[model samples]
Target: SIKDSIGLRIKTERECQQMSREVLCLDGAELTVRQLIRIEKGESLPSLDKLSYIAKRLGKSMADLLDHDRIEIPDTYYEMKNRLIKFPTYGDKERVKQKLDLIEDVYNQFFDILPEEELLTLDILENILSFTSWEERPKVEEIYEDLFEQVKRKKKFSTNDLLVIDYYFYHLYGRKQYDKKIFDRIVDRVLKQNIPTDDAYNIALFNDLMAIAGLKISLESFKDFLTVIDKLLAVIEKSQFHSYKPGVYILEAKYELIHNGNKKKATENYDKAIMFASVLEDSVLEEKTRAEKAADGLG
Candidate 1:
């Protein structure tokens, strides 16, 4: 296919010259990292004008880059990525396991051939799904050590990278690796990005923000933690993502109890958390809310 041929050629040349996808992306009209990923994966065929820019970037003629031998492989990476965002975030553990098996089937097929960045994205997705599917979730360090190190080196983070970093933070907190400076750096770097505001459909972003909230609570940084929670809650409300409401309510409940010693208000918030959890059929959050209410002496 012409799409595959040109996509493979540009991708091959970009790597041969050691160019990051960031360097190749012009941030031009539809030339963002995402569009380029689609192009490189052969899921999108760029227009001639777009191809002209890419050709000049590689210091070659458009015609020179366009010719290629037939590409036998289908657009493997993009389709797999679509599957990942679809399944893993949903709350069904068995469904997540099913998605993991399906994802691994393709990883076995094209893991060696995919671009390095694309490979990393899939690897992170695989780990996240497999980790979630486990009946006994393992320590974050057991699954994330090398993967965390690799992505932490990158200059930019995709949402997938953010999820991995969020999990790695759990490991840091678990191990009592009390390095506030690096923690601040990681969170600042993550929040500094203009995260897409319309990702209401994708709960992973909210989940990542909640992880940050959890860290802030444990670290005794209630001031900034308030900002994180409120901002996330505002977004959730505007998006009508009621499923995420329980976590924010629970965190705010903690803040009310521990930071302000407002047991009455904290109990109100805990009840709200449980109400949403029950209405939404989130058994885990419902159970957690009840337990925390008792533990806080509000039962």
Candidate 2:
């Protein structure tokens, strides 16, 4: 499926650029026109170097080519977003704007094909909008909010959709746009649902959300919170979601600090979170844990 889709994208871009297969082969690409034809025909995939060369020659990123009409947003989107750090803003304003536009365009295109990924893409766009210069952010924010409203209008949601919505509403809680009652209803609904293994990731994520909410609202007694946390940890343990391990440790650290008054144990768990985050190369998790530790010191 990917092969056919990628081939179609390559052919379309090549045609749009008015570039010939012969020209693609000649620019130190190390592949003959025949090989390029096979790649364009979906008969063969190119090597990394060749793919890179093709993307470069076509004035696109390898991500742009490989993301060809997929049902879900691929990992490349996040990888490329983080890798933007490598491109210095001092280089060229127009170039930077162009790159941002490409990223947004790709993100906006996901709305119709994949609801779960569409929401994730919106979150990424929200992150981008937060850091982008004020002059450039308004239009992006407007477009993002438009898409978000469209998704919100839907009456039914899969568990994955609910998790994303839950995360969105959680942020609103900080802005005072959402209250404890809303959070209570969300937690109640999520707890009542039977989570199948296919949606285990969302189950873990919702549990983490509820954990934080429970701690903040005193929604559950410490003993009840511990019971929920233990069950959440068990679900996490049974799944292959190792990427979320550092986050889970951070939650545990928070629980220890809040309920047990064990700053020593909390700090230990924070250290473990940092270690796991480093192993995963997740700067977000590492930074979050560090902030939690600093706040614990102040408290």
Candidate 3:
């Protein structure tokens, strides 16, 4: 019964559209009428390509087809959100602020169409109000208490959900052993969801891991710090989201200095970070790396 659920959903959607087997299969949907009948009857599942074509005709995402309750959303909503999702990785404060401004100007346009993502976007804005600077940030006690209730609420960690949680983790307060334990619970439960492969989602995942690394760094837990750095590097390499490359590089540059007094290796990592930041034209981080190098007496 569970397995046949998709077929039932496909059938329901087709009928809801007042689409017949004859008409639904007429276009580039590719599958034959009998094939459609089979899929609807649960004789078999459609392969991804066929499903894609069917979803295209139905104006549903493949995810929607399986999940069944998703509101039919406009393409523009997701397209814009995807664009906005990638902006933070660049770390250009004014640019991202302007982009957020443009997005905020149209908050109402898609809010009804995609409330989940809109709420996620709002959470992101609240967090970044402090990120790019200037604002009385919402108290982490307020933010954390509210967000923690949602953690085990449904275990439904979609990309958008993770994006929202990622910001909550970042905006947290109190760098103490106690607070770090709370983060450990969040991380353990959140990792139950498969890590999304989208570069935008990877950016969120990167920040979540970065949050863990940051707390560990503050706690003076050097042994676990390098472990966190290694995992961070692996994510960057896998996702190829090089916007985050310099941050990770600078982290390691300092870790080498602190943990090993390895100035040569520290400088080597710093140069690598600086060169990459220049390649990406991220002068903000480039200046940071330079400043950190001097402060570490390795400039």
Candidate 4:
């Protein structure tokens, strides 16, 4: 069934990209156009190395290329995954288990249908944490010990996998594991890697967290704070996360007011925040910005 699914997804994605079979075969691999057609026709299965090569040519992870039904992942699953990954460190273990139980339920339902390797790895990670069992919650370092080695053995990771890793590392930071150094390292890795375009929002959210925590390259300097703000602004502006831009603007306004005594510039940024919040249809952000502005006498 995985063979059939892989064939179907490969043909579908190839066509979606408007790529001809001949064009797909020109990737300097030994895959002939006839062999490609055979694979698409489900007449044969590719070897593991060939599967990876095909994924490279299609600009997808092997897991993604093999997963014909990933779009069928429930909306609740998506929400739960985001919540779990971004789960607060101060959050109670009981509450964490509650969320994980819901997630594991969904994962179990789809586990047999989706034979994706990354998903399996994630499931293992959750199982080790024993969200439904009485086992003690593992420390951040132990999790890293189990998780990082497995990830390294996988050679390449899916964007979804990277997003999970991003959240996992952030959780470690919140747990006070190596503090700002690990935070900076993870953020720098995300910025440097060619992550899937859809996962850009994850990067945006991580940037926001770093900015909020005031994690800095140099804790003693206002210049470091400004650098964080500038980097956050750059990410939010280039991202599709327009709703997040208001937070960056508010940060900029605070920095200008405190450091430069530039009430005019600060007020301008506040107005920008209010405007973007309105466009985002986020009444809470809009009201929050207006309240902050009024408090500063710039309303």
* Backbone collisions counted per model: 0, 0, 0, 0
| lDDT, each prediction | 0.66, 0.55, 0.65, 0.57
* Model 2 alpha-carbon drift over 4 Å, by segment: 1-160, 167-171, 175-178, 197-224, 231-235, 278-295
Give one digit per residue, the lDDT tens place, for model 3 in 1-299.
42267779999999999999888877322556765775687655565556777898899989988885334557786777677666673556677677677567556665543422344455565456446321344443333333344554545565555656666555553435455555656665554545556877776667777776665566665555666777677778878867687888888887788778899999999888888787775477778777877887986
Return the clash pairs for model 3, or none.
none
Q: What are the TM-scores, per candidate, against the unseen true structure?
A: 0.62, 0.42, 0.62, 0.46
Q: What is the lDDT of candidate 1?
A: 0.66
Best by lDDT: 1
- Candidate 4 lDDT over 66-114, as tens digits, reads 6643323456655655555544322247756775675577666555433
lDDT of 2 at 122: 50
- Candidate 3 residue runs with Cα over 4 Å from true position: 1-71, 129-147, 153-156, 188-196, 221-223, 259-261, 281-284
Error of 2 at 170 (Å): 4.2
Q: Write the per-residue lDDT of candidate 2 for residues 206-268, one digit (tens) a residue.
A: 444554545443433344455455555555565555555666677777778877888888888
Count backbone clashes in candidate 1: 0
What is the C-alpha lDDT profile of model 1 across 74-112, one tens digit per residue?
666656665665453444677777877877777787654
User: Worst 10-residue stretch by lDDT in candidate 2?
Assistant: 82-91
